[PDB]
Amino acid sequence: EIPLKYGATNEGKRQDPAMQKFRDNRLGAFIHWGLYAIPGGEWNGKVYGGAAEWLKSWAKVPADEWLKLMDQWNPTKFDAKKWAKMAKEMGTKYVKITTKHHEGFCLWPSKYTKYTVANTPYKRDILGELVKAYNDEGIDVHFYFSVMDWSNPDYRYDIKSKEDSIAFSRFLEFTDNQLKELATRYPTVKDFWFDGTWDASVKKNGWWTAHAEQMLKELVPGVAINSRLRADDKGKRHFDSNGRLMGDYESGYERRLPDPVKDLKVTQWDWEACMTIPENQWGYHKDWSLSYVKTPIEVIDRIVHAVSMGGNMVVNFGPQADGDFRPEEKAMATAIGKWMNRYGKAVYACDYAGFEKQDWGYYTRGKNDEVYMVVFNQPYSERLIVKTPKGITVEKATLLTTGEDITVVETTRNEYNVSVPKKNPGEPYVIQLKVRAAK
Ligand SMILES: C[C@@H]1N[C@@H](C#Cc2ccccc2)[C@H](O)[C@@H]1O
């Protein structure tokens, strides 16, 4: 056992109503919008295949020249009420917004830097408009914040001198100022999701990460803080040197997910995954033909996968420079929305069911011990295998959409065949089980 000043604080999972809400929400959308949307992956006539929001890096653009894009920031089609309506219709319960990405341009008019929305043709507080619009739809808002900042020359990648240490100390104060500003300007915020915390400079300054967490929790009652912020005394990130989770939820599953058989450890803490639609594009990229683009069922599979293992999922969108969404993203949101409207009782407010994974799909467990079978892979056998934990029996099965009764046949002690529906649903579908535990 190691002694630590800046390690974990939470015992197990938070069970206050604010965390229960963060959890129960389950499905969110991510918005990556920044100056990178203007060039859209292309610089000086060359299209780069890397993530469009990192184009400054790929094309080696100096900060002064990158930040001049502010002069073209004029999203005339932007309408926050329309954005919120799109998120509502998708069935998202929350949205995570890039308040500032690595480029350093702020979507709110920060008083601590000139690189903000206020100094663009458009002038308006985008972020404030979004907060208000989403909240009006009953949709929680979470703020993405990049610690790394390519616009501020006090940023350091590592501390190699006393000069570096002085500069970086200023940078942290500047960061604290932006954070307090966001918290006090927009007090309905439910979560801060830190990114760009991987450099040695941050790892060496664990104390600050713990401080940022406590500071924001004092300013916003019940606010959530992601693990990715946090580093301990020894520079160990996410989980401290005694294996304990820092922050309120685990936040490392990015464009990947834990294995449903081998990574059951994740059910012991709250966590959230995020994903892109193309292979690796978060900001708007002009050419989606350059990598594989997921279909709606592929996205829905990942969402349900997350919930089945006790985690949330956040699907990313990268709005155009003009403030509208591309057609592929509108189609996706609409498709997800249709399916969630029909089957979302197996997603919202659900969790890990404690059953052995089977090949047909995923189990989720409801708040009143409902066990849902979410079927993505239809067996030619016409039988869905259900192996129960010790002491649990299956009393009934019901097709969720129609209420029709589904035959259940005991095959062995602790195992059943649940029939497929008489008519093939023709899409991923849900069978609800009634289970009983021995007494
Ligand atoms: C949520 C995503 N995190 C950002 C990143 C990254 C990254 C950078 C270097 C190596 C591996 C991952 C992406 O640009 C996006 O914000």
Automatic annotation (TrEMBL):
One of its GO terms (biological process) is glycoside catabolic process. It comes from the Bacteria. The record marks C274 as: May be important for catalysis. One of its GO terms (cellular component) is lysosome. Its EC number is 3.2.1.51. It is an enzyme of class 3 (hydrolase). Alpha-L-fucosidase is responsible for hydrolyzing the alpha-1,6-linked fucose joined to the reducing-end N-acetylglucosamine of the carbohydrate moieties of glycoproteins. This is alpha-L-fucosidase. It comes from Bacteroides thetaiotaomicron (strain ATCC 29148 / DSM 2079 / JCM 5827 / CCUG 10774 / NCTC 10582 / VPI-5482 / E50). The lineage of its organism: Bacteria, Pseudomonadati, Bacteroidota, Bacteroidia, Bacteroidales.
